[PDB]
Amino acid sequence: VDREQLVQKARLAEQAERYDDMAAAMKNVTELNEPLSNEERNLLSVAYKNVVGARRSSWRVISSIEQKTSADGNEKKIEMVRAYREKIEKELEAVCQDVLSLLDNYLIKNCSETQYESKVFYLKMKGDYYRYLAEVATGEKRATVVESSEKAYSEAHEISKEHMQPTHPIRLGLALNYSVFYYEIQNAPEQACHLAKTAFDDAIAELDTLNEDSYKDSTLIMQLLRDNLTLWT
């Protein structure tokens, strides 16, 4: 059982656009109960992002059609579109639960006090995947996953504020996603704008704290913050 082969597998699977294989390899790496390098973290994130991403994209297409045919008033067709939506939801939720279990029982658990970058990165993932659950949940189940999403982002934001520079890509990326959560999930546009503007402004104030290694990644997330802000206003 060779950790380096599993990582190489993941790199191969990514190149061949086989994201299930990539997720499986990186899951297996995580299960070895040893910390992930930066490259390994991203390999895990990219893998599950695509696996869940294809279901999210399918669910939107299906929901969108469900709306139109629901209005059209043809049951037999409506039942089948709805059943298909449910089938995709179950897939999506299974992927989210899979990631969350890795996060809670391996990745967040094994972060030491000083591994701030990793804690924020993982807590942000935890917020993201509960947010993906929130996108498709209704009733009490929605309320629960929304609370969980909020608690993950909230904690990640505390750690980021205290221990990372305003221009740090991971901190910026969290502000980005957390603000999206505020707008789309909590329907709190004021809170969303405040977070995105603050994060953007704070990065700009300390713009000289950019290393050439982070310049490109930070400035690009900053554009996204601004893009969202322009849209929301």
């Binding site: 603000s179 997330i221 969202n228 849209l231 929301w232």
Partner: peptide, 6 residues
């Protein structure tokens, strides 16, 4: 229509 981290 808001965009999250790619």
């Amino acid at each position: 229509r808001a965009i999250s981290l790619p």
